[PDB]
């Protein structure tokens, strides 16, 4: 019948009605890139490619969650091993992430938005599934569990129940881009990245000052966390990754669980921090795809899970939110002190002047000395990173 594609367009020359004319459907017109998600009959893909103003026709590829059940806890608050491993709790007196301009967007299976250990930190929920952007909580709710678990590793509340996140005061945007089985289309994921930049108010840079992340006048997230991965590198997705990066947003993603030689997408992009998984003995997990940028706890990870529950999962998906939490603590501390955020930085940054530079120099260097193919620069450490940021 119909196939989903994403066209990159010249906006002066492209007419969406010409798509409608061939028996297609306009799914989503991106605000931040010159591209449109459309459905067209198979027979019309040729006609699309020749339409005026159509510069590229790309097909809609699939990504999957990167977390699975490993195999449960007392009634009091438990501190999962990985939260102490990334040296987070000592930071909280300085900041636990509750600086008001900071939000972390988690693009995943949705969230148990009323979970007692998460609810006070869930600031906004949206779903982009099938290219239909919804802020109905019933569409945003997690039907899988994975997204709830990831968000609790970042931001579960520090109190007397449940668990606790790396940045337990930080505001979360849950952006639902993966269905009940944890599969997601690249189109929905790119609409999700866009929504994290646009934020609740639907405008990227509302006062027109060119500042998006770290502007208190805007509601852009400062961190986008993607515990998911795909095999394809598509130009429109990368264009959206670059918009986020250029908005000053730190992007973090799981390297993948295939023990493959390099990270999946979007982790593999230069502008994204790829995260590998360690276990509780500081060994790299054998499933962890290699050549990550940093590594973090990703085996036997206890966190929140629907409905008002807790679960132990494993995968590079569980490692990623540890790193996203550390980044939130870095930006929050930096803003608290200076009234601005740090630049994101690059894959090979090695200075205290960028988020990624801090992460790399303060990471616990494991296995062979320096960056290696298993650990990346090593295991992220919040207490040291914040010390570097503020120094």
211 binds Ca ion (CB under 5 A): yes
- Smallest distance, Å, CB 171 to Ca ion? 8
- Member of 39, 112, 142, 218 binding Ca ion (CB under 5 A): 218
Q: How far is CA 195 from CA 23, 191, 239, 288, in A?
A: 28, 6, 14, 29
| Bridge partners (DSSP) listed for residue 254 | 275
29 or 143: CB nearest Ca ion: 29
**CB of residue 103 to Ca ion, shortest distance in Å:** 5
Among 36, 39, 69, smallest CA distance to 55 is for: 36
Residues numbered 10 to 49 that lie near Ca ion (CB under 5 A) are none
Q: Tell me how far, at minimum, the Cβ of 160 lies from Ca ion, in Å.
A: 7
With binding defined as CB under 5 A, does residue 219 bind Ca ion? yes
Residue from 148, 165, 162 nearest 323 by CA: 165
Cβ of residue 33: shortest distance to Ca ion, in angstroms? 16
Kindly give, in sequence order, each residue whose CB lies less than 8 Å from that of residue 53, ignoring residues fewer than 6 positions away: 9, 10, 11, 12, 13, 14, 15
- DSSP letter, residue 224: E
Nearer to Ca ion, 102 or 386 (CB): 102
Q: How far is the CB of 376 from Ca ion (least distance, A)?
A: 8
Which residues, numbered 351-380, are part of the site for Ca ion (CB under 5 A)?
365, 367-368, 372, 375
* From candidates 67, 80, 97, 199, binder to Ca ion by CB under 5 A: 199
* Per CB under 5 A, 215 contacts Ca ion: yes
Site for Ca ion in 121-180 (CB under 5 A): 157, 159, 162, 164
- If the CB atoms of residues 64 and 363 are measured against Ca ion, the closer one turns out to be 363
Tell the smallest beta-carbon distance from residue 277 to Ca ion (Å): 15
Query: CB of 130: closest distance to Ca ion in angstroms?
Result: 23
Give min distance, CB of 78 to Ca ion, in A. 8
Distance CA 165, CA 83 (A): 7
Residue 197 or 382 with smaller CB distance to Ca ion: 197
* Contact stretch for Ca ion (CB under 5 A) within 74-82, 130-138, 334-342, 381-389: 74-82
Q: Which is nearer to Ca ion, 135 or 159 (CB)?
A: 159
Among 77, 78, 98, 246, binds Ca ion (CB under 5 A): 77
Distance of closest approach, residue 158 Cβ to Ca ion, in angstroms: 6
**235 closest CA partner among 264, 263, 266, 261:** 266
Q: Is 356 helix (H, G, I), strand (E, B) or coil?
A: helix
Report how far residue 280's alpha carbon sits from residue 87's, in angstroms, rounded to the nearest whole number: 14
Question: In the chain, after which residues is the C-to-N distance over 2.5 Å, breaking the chain?
Answer: 71
Q: Which residue, 23 or 202, has its beta carbon nearer to Ca ion?
A: 202
| Cα-based angle 281, 381, 349 (whole degrees, multiple of 5) | 115
Strand 35-41 versus strand 2-9 pairing type = antiparallel
**Among 10, 84, 201, 307, interactor with Ca ion by CB under 5 A:** 201
Sheet of strand 309-314: strand arrangement: 68-69, 309-314, 301-305
Candidates 174, 164, 385; CA nearest to 294 is: 385
Counting every residue, how long is the chain? 391
| 202: number of Cβ within 10 Å | 11
Question: Which residues are at the interface with Ca ion (CB under 5 A)?
Answer: 77, 101, 103, 117, 157, 159, 162, 164, 199, 201, 203, 205, 207, 209, 211, 215, 217-220, 365, 367-368, 372, 375
């Amino acid at each position: 019948n119909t196939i989903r594609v994403i066209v990159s367009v010249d906006k002066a020359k492209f007419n969406p009605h010409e798509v409608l004319g061939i028996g297609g459907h306009i799914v989503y017109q991106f605000k931040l890139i010159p591209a449109v998600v459309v459905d067209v009959p198979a027979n019309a893909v040729g006609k699309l490619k020749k339409m005026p103003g159509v510069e590229k026709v790309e097909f809609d590829h699939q990504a999957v969650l990167l977390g699975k059940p490993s195999w449960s806890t007392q009634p009091a608050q438990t501190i999962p091993w990985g939260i102490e491993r990334v040296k987070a709790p000592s930071v909280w007196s300085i900041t636990d992430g509750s600086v008001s301009v900071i939000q972390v967007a988690v693009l995943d299976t949705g969230v148990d938005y009323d979970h007692p250990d998460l609810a006070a930190n869930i600031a906004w929920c949206v779903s982009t599934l099938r290219g239909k952007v919804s802020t109905k909580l019933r569409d945003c709710a997690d039907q899988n569990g994975h997204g709830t678990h990831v968000i609790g590793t970042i931001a579960a509340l520090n109190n007397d129940i449940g668990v606790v996140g790396v940045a337990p005061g930080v505001q979360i945007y849950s952006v639902r881009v993966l269905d009940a089985r944890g599969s997601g289309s690249y189109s929905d994921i790119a609409i999700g990245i866009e929504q994290a930049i646009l934020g609740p108010d639907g405008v990227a840079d509302k006062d027109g000052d060119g500042i998006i992340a770290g502007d208190p006048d805007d509601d852009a997230a400062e961190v986008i966390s993607m515990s998911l991965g795909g095999p394809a590198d598509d130009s429109y997705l990368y264009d959206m990754i670059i918009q986020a990066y250029n908005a000053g947003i730190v992007i973090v993603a799981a390297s993948g669980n295939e023990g493959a030689p390099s990270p999946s997408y979007p982790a593999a992009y230069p502008e994204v921090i790829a995260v590998g998984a360690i276990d509780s003995n500081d060994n790299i997990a054998s499933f962890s795809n290699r050549q990550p940028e940093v590594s973090a706890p990703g085996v036997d990870i206890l966190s929140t899970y629907p409905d008002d529950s807790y679960e132990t999962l494993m995968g590079t998906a569980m490692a990623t939110p540890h790193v996203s939490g550390v980044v939130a603590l870095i930006q929050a501390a930096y803003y608290q002190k200076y009234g601005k955020i740090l630049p994101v930085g690059t894959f090979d940054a090695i200075s205290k002047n960028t988020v990624r530079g801090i992460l790399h120099i303060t990471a616990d260097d494991l296995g062979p000395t320096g960056w290696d193919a298993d650990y990346g620069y090593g295991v992220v450490r919040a207490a040291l990173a914040v010390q570097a940021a503020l120094g």
